[PDB]
């Protein structure tokens, strides 16, 4: 159900890409974006907390990535190393988690 869409899926080097989220769950606790196909705290790009309505960077934040309350992720001035897979984990109010992975290609 939970899905992510890369807009655009093909990004020119130095442009912007917005990873949209669609089937967001009903009651939510927070979102977290991870570089790669796995949820790993050492690869956490950024985190959003529903309660604090605040965004906290992670070890894999280069300052260009920004998360939003709609769970969408914006990467500006994209580099070649930004290409690949990205994993989104949505933590619900039940503390049960939903995961969705997206990707985009930098040319």
């Amino acid at each position: 159900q939970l899905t992510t869409e890369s807009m655009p899926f093909n990004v020119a080097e130095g442009k912007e890409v917005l990873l949209l989220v669609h089937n967001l769950p009903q009651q939510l606790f927070g979102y977290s974006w991870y570089k790669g196909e796995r949820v790993d705290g050492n690869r956490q790009i950024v985190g959003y907390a529903i309660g604090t309505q605040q965004a906290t960077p992670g070890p894999a934040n280069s300052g260009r990535e920004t998360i939003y309350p709609n769970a969408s992720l914006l990467i500006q001035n994209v580099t070649q190393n930004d290409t690949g897979f990205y994993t989104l984990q949505v933590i619900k109010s039940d503390l049960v988690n939903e995961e969705a992975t997206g990707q985009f290609h930098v040319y």
């Binding site: 979102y31 907390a49 503390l95």
Partner: protein, 106 residues
Amino acid sequence: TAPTLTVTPEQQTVKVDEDITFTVTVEDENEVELGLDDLKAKYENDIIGARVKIKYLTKEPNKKVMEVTIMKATLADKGAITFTAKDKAGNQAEPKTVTINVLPLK
């Protein structure tokens, strides 16, 4: 009747850079609500950042078993987390708390 709330281990002592695990179990004759307010408050960003892992071993409407793992302990993880449990009829269970102590690596 009243819901049954049990937490294991009730108290534990770990060292720095070690994982802390405890399990919360609640069951009753009707749908139970596990009180996560204190757990959420202590480790909000840690839950969101995958540093604290929440694993529901059982998620039945009237029986919930939840395993909490705090990875790579710091001295700030020394503390207490309280859990509550009530059924739909409002019959509350006696709250139980987890005590965690972290020791320096020396």
